[PDB]
Amino acid sequence: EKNVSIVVAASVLSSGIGINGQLPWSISEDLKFFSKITNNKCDSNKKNALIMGRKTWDSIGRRPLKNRIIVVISSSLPQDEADPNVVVFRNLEDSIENLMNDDSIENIFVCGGESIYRDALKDNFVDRIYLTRVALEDIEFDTYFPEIPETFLPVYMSQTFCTKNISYDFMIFEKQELKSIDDTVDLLGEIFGIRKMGNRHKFPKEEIYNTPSIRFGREHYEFQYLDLLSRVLENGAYRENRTGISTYSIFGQMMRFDMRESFPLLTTKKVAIRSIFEELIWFIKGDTNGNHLIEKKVYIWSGNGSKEYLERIGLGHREENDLGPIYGFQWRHYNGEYKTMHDDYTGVGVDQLAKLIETLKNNPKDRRHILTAWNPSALSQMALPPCHVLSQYYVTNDNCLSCNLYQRSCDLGLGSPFNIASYAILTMMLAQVCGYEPGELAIFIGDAHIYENHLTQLKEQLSRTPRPFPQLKFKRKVENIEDFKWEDIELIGYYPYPTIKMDMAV
Amino acid sequence: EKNVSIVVAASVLSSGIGINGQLPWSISEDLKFFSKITNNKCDSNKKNALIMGRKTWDSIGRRPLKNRIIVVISSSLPQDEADPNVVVFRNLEDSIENLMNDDSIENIFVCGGESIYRDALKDNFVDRIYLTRVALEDIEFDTYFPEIPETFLPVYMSQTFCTKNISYDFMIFEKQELKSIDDTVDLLGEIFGIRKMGNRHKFPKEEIYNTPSIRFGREHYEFQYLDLLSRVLENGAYRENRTGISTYSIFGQMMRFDMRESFPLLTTKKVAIRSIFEELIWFIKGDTNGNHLIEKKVYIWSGNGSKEYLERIGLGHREENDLGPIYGFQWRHYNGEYKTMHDDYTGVGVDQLAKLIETLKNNPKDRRHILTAWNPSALSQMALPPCHVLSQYYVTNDNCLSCNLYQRSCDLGLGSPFNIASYAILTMMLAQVCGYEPGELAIFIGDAHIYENHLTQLKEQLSRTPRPFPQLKFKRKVENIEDFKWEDIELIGYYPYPTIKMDMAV
Numbered sequence A, B: 001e002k003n004v005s006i007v008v009a010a011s012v013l014s015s016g017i018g019i020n021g022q023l024p025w026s027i028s029e030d031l032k033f034f035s036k037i038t039n040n041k042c043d044s045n046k047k048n049a050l051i052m053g054r055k056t057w058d059s060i061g062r063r064p065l066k067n068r069i070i071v072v073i074s075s076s077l078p079q080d081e082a083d084p085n086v087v088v089f090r091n092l093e094d095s096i097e098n099l100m101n102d103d104s105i106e107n108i109f110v111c112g113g114e115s116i117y118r119d120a121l122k123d124n125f126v127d128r129i130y131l132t133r134v135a136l137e138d139i140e141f142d143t144y145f146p147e148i149p150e151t152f153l154p155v156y157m158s159q160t161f162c163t164k165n166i167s168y169d170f171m172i173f174e175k176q177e178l179k180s181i182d183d184t185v186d187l188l189g190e191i192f193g194i195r196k197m198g199n200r201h202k203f204p205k206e207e208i209y210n211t212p213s214i215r216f217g218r219e220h221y222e223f224q225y226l227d228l229l230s231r232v233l234e235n236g237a238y239r240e241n242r243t244g245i246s247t248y249s250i251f252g253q254m255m256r257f258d259m260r261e262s263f264p265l266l267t268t269k270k271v272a273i274r275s276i277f278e279e280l281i282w283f284i285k286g287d288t289n290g291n292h293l294i295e296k297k298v299y300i301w302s303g304n305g306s307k308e309y310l311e312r313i314g315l316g317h318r319e320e321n322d323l324g325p326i327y328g329f330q331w332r333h334y335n336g337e338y339k340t341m342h343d344d345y346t347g348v349g350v351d352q353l354a355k356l357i358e359t360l361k362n363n364p365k366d367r368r369h370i371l372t373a374w375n376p377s378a379l380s381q382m383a384l385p386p387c388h389v390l391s392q393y394y395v396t397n398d399n400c401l402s403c404n405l406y407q408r409s410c411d412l413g414l415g416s417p418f419n420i421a422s423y424a425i426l427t428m429m430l431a432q433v434c435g436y437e438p439g440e441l442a443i444f445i446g447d448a449h450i451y452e453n454h455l456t457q458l459k460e461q462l463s464r465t466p467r468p469f470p471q472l473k474f475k476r477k478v479e480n481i482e483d484f485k486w487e488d489i490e491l492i493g494y495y496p497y498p499t500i501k502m503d504m505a506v
């Protein structure tokens, strides 16, 4: 009685694994994974058995795999004994004889095709599933991996990797069949109430924890966003704010995201990537004219830039969509005397973005690559104070550009998915203009909150198991950072869950 | 063969447990801990046995403890059978008969005095130790808890709690005698090099991990600082900077500290608390005259305010210790045109500190309680750009004041212990002036680094197991935040390890 594991690489949506007797992709690192996972043994005097169907045995050229015993399931192949590393059985059930005897076999791996996968699960022989989810769907398949039965639960989901602009994951499914420290902490939590800080940071209940079966393997960095939602639903204090919509709030949180092998665009909800870009280039160009976003069919700043909103906050003399000195005016003209959105500001103020770019390539190990938007002198003139307040950038020794952002207030339903993708794109733009590669993205949050009208929507999003992050590549190398256009951005392999509508609080 | 655990409350340094037949303190929550830990059982048809010496049996008034069987070790007490909850044995060894039979006893607790503790460890009967470290040392003891033998290792250390301005810890010592996920992550780490983000955030090796036996119980929030040192020693990239002393650096880190039940002043090194306060009030008063710190025997700003340093960075015409517009000038006179440190700036600039205090008590749930020091217009005039760059404040529903700080550059050997305590004091000052209680402190760090001349010292500090945090209380309620004096601060129960000398890089 030893372990039996399925190893498979299937597409993210339809679970396709083959086409015309071969794989529908060529991912070198996935083969190395297959090699290392099937050679993984504990006894040096034992080998692992790899069960596969005849057509898969043809796919690998009918040649043995080093340090392993291949078991071919076939009704016609001669039960040859010349090759000791290849053995043939007439059916899958009889081939599980590696359990009954043959103590020289330690582990068993089911590597075969659709036929072998389908009746290995139907016969209930499989204990574990090693799934490699590949983000390729608009191609043709003729061989599929069967649907994983409900008796299996995911226990691990790796970060998103990239090969030839193809995103892929690594997951482990398992079939469902110290205490003195946990008790001591519980007892101290009964004595001290909220005086024990752990009781103010309670672990999220299972009913609000995304994919709860993955306990020790939440490597996918979309969990950095989904677990923050769970922590707010668990510990968020009901609080009123300047809008009529109250929130559940906590203070002091952070999220990490990789940008080397993926792009942190959420997959549990379809995110409007075009509106994010058009706002970011709007900041970079130094623009505060709210109409230029509306002319490009981007209405995210309509609520905070209406005549009724501006008159209520004390800016009745301001034009309709004149947002005042905000992001992109403190970026390019810091401390510049603001007039209107129509005046010419070329020359006035401190151009932080230009000095940032010049410093990134002239003194990379400098510890002052800082871009700020919090200007106490201009706060009164703003339609809304900056939420992403200050950001720092860092050049690694292997010529990668990382980014840190402090966010004073974070709408986790709407602003946060935008902020994650926006500062990811900005770091990639700065990386290309400065001749670096994208690094990491960290977001430090002050008031992380959830508006009460987003509760049903965000709980729906928590019911969706994440998919691998997409890729984002630029089609051309610009000379100045302002020259980026939406046509220059290619979003490769993005298969999100359906969009979720959420109303913004004005 | 069941479990035998010691429950004891001893002082932090000398391990004193008694004086004149009673406890040298009165901590109510510690008694509740003793009650809940000794009543903790798994079988409802079984009781726990509490072994204690005769003098301890006298200390509790010779009355039984509810739901438990008290076992008194005495050579003279009559082996009475009238009370079924109290039984007498002639020696400690015979009383361990609860192991041989008496299946109605589930767990055994050694609660007695020094005599019972000493030969319960000498006789090698004890499996676990529940230690309550109390921060009281300048009093008199006549009964001590013996030194814990090397066969025990700590596995848990709680946060610091407070009762009547007395700090105390809860520790667990234990006597020394899924795999598929760990392997899958290891194999993916062999395939991808630094492409897998986990490989850029490697867990610290045991040789650089403070108190390595505490794996799942690192609750004491001084580990938030000690584990950051370990992560830098593990993943820090060797990098050159504006000083001749290179550092080992990582980007994007954070630390949490409680301020409700303790004051986050490090115990693994004696920290100059007076210099921290005198610098903070120097900031609050709006002062940039470096001589006012030297006149009070505080020399932390001497290096960045010398004639040779100022002439080297391009401020040769600046006076000796004229640091320019820095912390406390952007606090009290933001965007104010700076001349020298002798001129009068009352009225010029934006007084952030006043607007912060006014906003904290007039609009507590406001999400804009922000204090910044990053002024791109004044960076060139500064003797050194701000390291603690921006801080945000937050009022909880139970009227506590929390603080978040973003630090662009963090000298983990010198500045970081100062930054942790300084912004803790500032948050407490703002809390008293605004009528709140201290909350939590979170520090988000950009360039966390260790100077190479601090390696021997910081490794020495990592060899010291932390002690409970002290308390910091104000002696009087001031009317204005500027009126705080060093005499107004009371540091209660601070017993640190000896100070460690580390030279500052200019």
Ligand SMILES: NC(=O)C1=CN([C@@H]2O[C@H](COP(=O)(O)OP(=O)(O)OC[C@H]3O[C@@H](n4cnc5c(N)ncnc54)[C@H](OP(=O)(O)O)[C@@H]3O)[C@@H](O)[C@H]2O)C=CC1
Residues within 6 Å of the ligand: A007, A008, A009, A010, A016, A017, A018, A019, A020, A021, A022, A023, A052, A053, A054, A055, A056, A057, A059, A073, A074, A075, A076, A077, A090, A091, A092, A111, A112, A113, A114, A115, A116, A119, A143
């Ligand atoms: N992405 C991935 O991880 C993998 C993809 N693939 C791909 O899938 C395709 C191959 O899969 P598939 O088309 O299903 O072919 P199979 O690999 O499943 O092989 C089928 C053969 O196995 C034998 N067989 C199957 N079931 C039985 C049975 N119940 N009793 C006796 N013999 C049986 C038969 O051999 P016979 O006719 O001789 O009797 C049958 O023709 C290829 O494109 C391959 O590249 C394959 C493996 C992994």
Ligand SMILES: NC(=O)C1=CN([C@@H]2O[C@H](COP(=O)(O)OP(=O)(O)OC[C@H]3O[C@@H](n4cnc5c(N)ncnc54)[C@H](OP(=O)(O)O)[C@@H]3O)[C@@H](O)[C@H]2O)C=CC1
Residues within 6 Å of the ligand: B007, B008, B009, B010, B016, B017, B018, B019, B020, B021, B022, B023, B052, B053, B054, B055, B056, B057, B059, B073, B074, B075, B076, B077, B090, B091, B092, B111, B112, B113, B114, B115, B116, B143
């Ligand atoms: N902080 C804490 O957690 C605790 C503190 N304490 C404090 O410690 C003090 C008391 O401890 P302590 O002074 O050591 O006295 P003890 O509680 O250890 O009691 C000693 C008595 O136990 C009996 N005894 C001890 N050893 C033996 C033996 N080898 N064979 C037979 N009988 C033995 C003797 O009783 P007899 O003379 O009758 O034969 C002896 O006088 C008090 O101040 C108490 O408050 C006590 C418990 C816990």
Ligand SMILES: CN(Cc1cnc2nc(N)nc(N)c2n1)c1ccc(C(=O)N[C@@H](CCC(=O)O)C(=O)O)cc1
Residues within 6 Å of the ligand: A007, A008, A009, A023, A028, A030, A031, A032, A033, A034, A035, A036, A056, A059, A060, A065, A066, A110, A111, A112, A131, A132
């Ligand atoms: C056609 N086929 C089936 C195949 C392909 N990809 C998969 N990918 C996964 N994740 N799981 C599978 N079961 C799987 N099976 C193949 C193809 C090549 C090798 C192979 O050459 N393996 C070498 C590895 C070669 C190298 O290291 O790159 C080994 O040592 O195991 C195995 C199976």
Ligand SMILES: CN(Cc1cnc2nc(N)nc(N)c2n1)c1ccc(C(=O)N[C@@H](CCC(=O)O)C(=O)O)cc1
Residues within 6 Å of the ligand: B007, B008, B009, B023, B028, B030, B031, B032, B033, B034, B035, B036, B038, B056, B059, B060, B065, B066, B110, B111, B112, B131, B132
């Ligand atoms: C003198 N003495 C010994 C004593 C005192 N403090 C300790 N503190 C610790 N952490 N550990 C000990 N073994 C310990 N022992 C005492 C004193 C009172 C009670 C006691 O009354 N316990 C009640 C608790 C009372 C309450 O809940 O406040 C119980 O039900 O267990 C026990 C032991």
Ligand SMILES: Nc1nc2[nH]cc(Cc3ccc(C(=O)NCc4ccccc4C(=O)O)cc3)c2c(=O)[nH]1
Residues within 6 Å of the ligand: A270, A271, A272, A275, A299, A300, A301, A304, A384, A411, A414, A415, A416, A418, A499, A500, A502, A503, A504, A505, A506
């Ligand atoms: N309270 C508050 N005030 C704020 N001011 C400015 C912002 C930024 C912002 C403002 C509005 C949005 C927004 O509605 N997107 C719509 C959308 C959501 C999900 C999926 C797709 C789409 C889509 O684009 O179709 C996003 C971001 C902001 C905020 O988020 N909250």
Ligand SMILES: Nc1nc2[nH]cc(Cc3ccc(C(=O)NCc4ccccc4C(=O)O)cc3)c2c(=O)[nH]1
Residues within 6 Å of the ligand: B270, B271, B272, B275, B299, B300, B301, B304, B384, B411, B414, B415, B416, B418, B499, B500, B502, B503, B504, B505, B506
């Ligand atoms: N590189 C670099 N440049 C910087 N400029 C300004 C600072 C702030 C600072 C500057 C200097 C110190 C400092 O030496 N304390 C000495 C000390 C350390 C431990 C215990 C006691 C004592 C004590 O004798 O009182 C601390 C803090 C700073 C820095 O920390 N690093």
Ligand SMILES: O=c1[nH]c(=O)n([C@H]2C[C@H](O)[C@@H](COP(=O)(O)O)O2)cc1F
Residues within 6 Å of the ligand: A241, A242, A384, A385, A387, A388, A408, A409, A410, A411, A412, A414, A415, A416, A419, B367, B368
């Ligand atoms: O980029 C943004 N991200 C974001 O989360 N918000 C949300 C946070 C909060 O819900 C609101 C600001 O409200 P307040 O100014 O009161 O903190 O804007 C706004 C942005 F522009």
Ligand SMILES: O=c1[nH]c(=O)n([C@H]2C[C@H](O)[C@@H](COP(=O)(O)O)O2)cc1F
Residues within 6 Å of the ligand: A367, A368, B241, B242, B385, B387, B388, B409, B410, B411, B412, B415, B416, B419
């Ligand atoms: O409060 C402070 N905290 C701190 O960490 N430094 C250190 C960080 C860095 O090692 C050094 C120089 O800053 P820079 O990165 O601009 O060279 O000052 C200085 C302070 F004043």
